[PDB]
Design a protein around this ligand. Structure first.
Ligand code: APR
Ligand code: APR
Ligand code: APR
Ligand code: APR
Ligand code: MN
Ligand code: MN
Ligand code: MN
Ligand code: MN
Lengths: 384, 384, 384, 384
């Protein structure tokens, strides 16, 4: 069919100070006890208590679960579901980056569907809406506060599982850039390059629509102008607010268009080595774009212009090549590792990695359909 | 504040055949009896019964209220609320164009907050969310299946009141282009030019954000290419699908950025003389743009390029004027009336029309703030 | 469906001297006696006997029917079927322009399907293929030596009936440019502008395919260069050969894509006043192109370039308008009448002319679907 | 002489689902049982039975001959005539690529003329038309469903003989893109580049006409955009349909313009080593183009533009040179071998390969007339 759908939370708050509304919103939802899912760093920095104060200052109780781990695991989700159940909670508030949103989302799905998070790996495999959730985002690259995606790790298959289900669209989303000033430069760069990967893969995806296209183009332009500014000075408020907008645009686009083999392979490198998601995407992006070039050359040529390149007097092909060169230049200027072996990757895993990548749902929307030898060759090119 | 929010239904279905899902979707909400709000023409066409059959084949009861009138009235809403309660309905399904959507939204809001619809004229004045509502759109220009706007006419004041409330965001939207092939050319032109007005006013609004900008730009570009095609041949499926996308983009843009004095004045001409909304917008747009030019000249110059104009070697001012000339050219090619006098408007009503235009909420986001005399001059110029 | 088809004779001869092969070819078909259908002018010029000698010198008998009239009539077809049967002919050879080709096609169809040519007005209504027919084309504009179209006049309805049937595709075609040198200048101009109309209407028709587009583009480019040369000096052999190629390109294109309201209206003016077909087409072309503009503005802009115009720095709309101006200038340079009233058309018939125009099959493929009032407007415009 | 001719089947069906008509169309022709000529691969995939049912449901009997081999052989034709005479068949339906079309065509010719296939090597070396044949094409190259060319391999001389006879033009053709979705990527690339070779050799051929030029230009332009997309994802329906159009355009063009030394040499390399026809053409295309440059420098400069290259500020020579560079880049991006020795070509057979190529009929239309040394040198340059 030629049918499509657009998903996002019904209410999404933006701008400096929006977090000061969480409690009121939680009260309007008619909830009484919320599990605060955050990470140990943000809890140690004091964010958990500062936000809990706002929540309980509105008549809703909150119990903090600062046990969401970068690249969240099935163990984190099971332990959280116990907290949720033992702690008599009726809502979830996620505070942090994509790991906290996805952990809270998985907890919320299993708290309403019963099984294990692994049971819902795939597309809309769940059979009921998740418990009420307000997602407070503090990184500029996931968009998970708006998506129907939750990435939970199989520690046994060592695979970052993709649960893509409409029932994990958060109830309300909050994007406060004042909460993002504290991102160190490497984190700023990695999340920003994850948003850029989101927008590029959404723009070349087979599930693209004119709506997702509008959003992705804006995201690329804004990231290209403001991400280096956010990496160079995290106290540049303009760059922070524009990167928050760019992150939401890119999340909006990929949620409804689909991603591709950058994310398909990155999920395997992250399930095997706990590498940062955004760094995997940044290392892989130029190679997968070069692989995809012959399928979407006009759109990669447009991406080169969106990325600031001059394409006057150039063929569509040469213009498309300037886009890969600009991506490599951006990654070089933001100090992204050059390959995966310098980070700890091994050949004895490449074939397994490639075989697992061909099973990720994101691969379904990649514009060029590959043979195992191609995924393997891409992974080999990303080793050095 | 630098704070903002983005609102839209959590689930939005697109594409040929999407209406065949209404019953299952309505069932998933756990509702049991829906009032089907439509107009007399579409009910006489058999569409009401087709949709009622799909709904009943999913275990939900249906009571048809086919009495929404073009420019729906407070009387239509009161009668609809009476029907809603007499048949013990727990949900609403709107089928048709903006008049049916707004009648249904108003019925649902009054059924959940009490009072009368006039009580909610303004911005976020109600306290409770409206009863479950699914919106099935059949015109390519309103976007009300996605907006928090319901425009109901005060018959006594002769004023099309604008109720701007987050609580009238539909639960789910359905945009099936197969349901729009039957629009006669005049309706296609008026609805398409209402969507173009939506996108333009959103782009020049004081409430614009990078997100709304993305959506509005795509809407203008698509309307410029496909609206004349849809007017020339309504059986052009590609044009119908692109207009279905453009109408939704423009709705998404104005719902979250705001409108301006085109809509503020159009609501008064429609409350006084019951003209088609899009025809009022098409007549007024060049005049409000010229009035607004000095406030957003860079953005009107960009609009000229989005509309296909060549601006090489021109100042921003001359490029912005070329946009007004292109807007005038599209209206003439779509056989839009030249002015309001030949339609029946009277000079002695101008002063009241302008006064009421300054009380509409859409005027709050107009980039240039007028005084009464300038609103009067605009209406006099629009008499022609 | 997206299904399509390409129709053309299996063998099509081109080049100086090709007619000297007709007799051999007729004999290769296994036929024994052919009815030579031509018009009185070429018969008085001696061409009928010259070709009959070539045919007889190969053992095929010939009976000349020089009774085909410009804008052939139903009476011509009845008289031809009588001769075909009385003279014990088993094949048909048409010699001349479109009038002779269509008369021969009609006789050949009725000789195999019975009934009357009137019964076959419309699309693929016939059950049996027509008797073997070889078409020798002597004008540079109709293309009927290759098409599945036969235009026969219903003398009482005063309507040029369009029989579009695959069973009237000639068996073999001969396009000898040596036979076209004798066309007087007005005939060269009228047939060439009928070919230009074929290519333009094929390019903007809703039934265009990449194949028809390729042929139509080539036709337009060649006509812009060589038609004026062939009108200014009919002894320019290069111009005559290039115009023969262009007529065939335009015929192949319209035969498989469709025409539009130029032909739909021209058939009515020709059935009422027996004006030359190409003159009717040339008078109407600018007005129907202007009416259709909003439906195919990109393709009319491309036509402006094919016609040699410079479109640098122009919007698609201004470029499309330059094409209409180029058509008007060419028609003026070839002494094409400015309007229809000066030739004898009467206002009191416009309504009938319009109503009959909406019943012609060529109207089905026009890119803009009109109303009766708009067809009437096109004619009033073409009257003065 | 200045004479020319255009040949193609009188009825040619295109588009998704056209194959569903084979049976009904076989019903027109009045035939009773057809030998279904295909290859073992499509027979093992089930296509043979699928089509056979469509033929059965129209009252026509079918005998499947799935013994056509890639690079069909004389032996294959004899086995075929044996079965068509045995099952007492009166028609032939070819299902597959160029090998199935050419095998069936040869069977149909010898079944009507009696001799041996080797005897009709050359041009118009036959006396009577072949038996009714409908060709259903499943590859995006060759064009054999429309040509008067049958290439049968003589197992003795190791020579792909080119029989160019009008008596082998199929009765009806079917180009259903739904049957081409299953072509694996290497087959998509090889067939598409065989089509590109057809269009280029037709464009630079000495037998080119304005008609062949129109068709070949369109084919080159479409291939440049859609062949890489069809190789990258064979489930791209738009790319498959556009390539089906392109292969038909290139077939119509080369059939009536001629080919050149790319095909002349490729036929010998394939007769010696059974290499795929399209891979032979792709390896040879740049070297023969460079040999031909001085004869057709303007048309190679035009091909550079048709292929998407920018030629601004360049001499005709440098642009024609950019065209060969674009052909090389296309061959490399679609993984086409760089030379023939890697595939197994022998440096001892170069003298015979070159001598046999100058005896191919395809060399007669090459724009540059060479010496044996030149053909030898081309083959040597294509060895590494
Ligand atoms: N505003 C902030 N200031 C300082 N540090 C922060 C901030 N926000 C997050 N951090 C720190 O950044 C670390 C990484 O947190 P993540 O949530 O894992 O980062 P993110 O890229 O946003 O999420 C990625 C996760 O979502 C999936 O899409 C993806 O596969 C991965 O599982 C954590 O230790 C967290 O404390
Ligand atoms: N697909 C269709 N086919 C044929 N007719 C249709 C179709 N859809 C609607 N119509 C007819 O068009 C007429 C106008 O109906 P509206 O709902 O008023 O059309 P629309 O322009 O979309 O809504 C305008 C209303 O919404 C507000 O934004 C605006 O202020 C106005 O009140 C009605 O009589 C309706 O039957
Ligand atoms: N080569 C020629 N030299 C001199 N005179 C010629 C030549 N060819 C044709 N004529 C003269 O041109 C006159 C008109 O002949 P037509 O066949 O009517 O001209 P043409 O434009 O080719 O066909 C028009 C007919 O075909 C339909 O498409 C169209 O509707 C019309 O009925 C005739 O009197 C004929 O003698
Ligand atoms: N739609 C399809 N799906 C899957 N496989 C296919 C399809 N079509 C063809 N194939 C496979 O392609 C293989 C080669 O078949 P060919 O007919 O030889 O391919 P093609 O390139 O079209 O023909 C080449 C032959 O025609 C001559 O012009 C040329 O000289 C050569 O002999 C076979 O194994 C066949 O099964
Ligand atoms: Mn990501
Ligand atoms: Mn509006
Ligand atoms: Mn004509
Ligand atoms: Mn070939």
């Amino acid at each position: 069919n030629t049918q499509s759908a657009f998903f996002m939370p019904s209410v999404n708050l933006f701008g400096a100070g929006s977090v000061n509304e969480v409690g009121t919103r939680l009260a309007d939802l008619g909830v009484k006890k919320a599990l605060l899912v955050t990470d140990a760093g943000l809890h140690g920095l004091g964010l958990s208590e500062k936000i809990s104060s706002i929540i309980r200052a509105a008549g809703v109780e909150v119990s903090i679960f600062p046990k969401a781990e970068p690249n969240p695991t099935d163990k984190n989700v099971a332990e959280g579901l116990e907290a949720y159940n033992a702690e008599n909670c009726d809502s979830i508030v996620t505070l942090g980056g994509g790991s906290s949103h996805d952990a809270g989302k998985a907890i919320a799905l299993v708290a309403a569907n019963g099984g294990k998070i692994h049971d819902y790996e795939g597309v809309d495999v769940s059979k009921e809406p998740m418990v009420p959730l307000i997602a407070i985002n503090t990184t500029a690259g996931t968009g998970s506060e708006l998506t129907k995606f939750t990435i939970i790790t199989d520690t046994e298959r060592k695979v970052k599982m993709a649960i893509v289900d409409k029932h994990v669209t958060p109830t309300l989303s909050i994007n406060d850039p004042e909460l993002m000033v504290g991102m160190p430069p490497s984190l700023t760069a990695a999340t920003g390059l994850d948003a850029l990967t989101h927008a590029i893969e959404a723009y070349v995806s087979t599930g693209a629509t004119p709506i997702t296209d509008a959003l992705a183009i804006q995201a690329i332009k804004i990231i290209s102008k403001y991400l280096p500014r956010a990496v160079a000075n995290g106290k540049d408020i303009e760059a922070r607010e524009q990167m928050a907008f760019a992150q939401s645009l890119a999340g909006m686009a990929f949620n409804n268009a689909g991603l591709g083999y950058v994310h398909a392979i990155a999920h395997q490198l992250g399930g095997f080595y706990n590498f940062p998601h955004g760094v995997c995407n940044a290392v892989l992006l130029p190679y997968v774009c070069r692989f995809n070039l012959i399928s979407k050359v006009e759109r990669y040529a447009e991406i080169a212009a969106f990325l600031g390149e001059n394409v006057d007097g150039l063929s569509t092909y040469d213009a498309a090549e300037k886009a890969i060169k600009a991506i490599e230049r951006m990654a070089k200027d933001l100090n992204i590792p050059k390959g995966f072996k310098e980070l700890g990757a091994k050949e004895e895993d490449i074939e397994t990695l490639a075989k697992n990548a061909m099973k990720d749902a994101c691969a379904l929307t990649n514009p060029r359909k590959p043979k195992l030898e191609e995924v393997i060759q891409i992974i080999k090119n990303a080793m050095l």
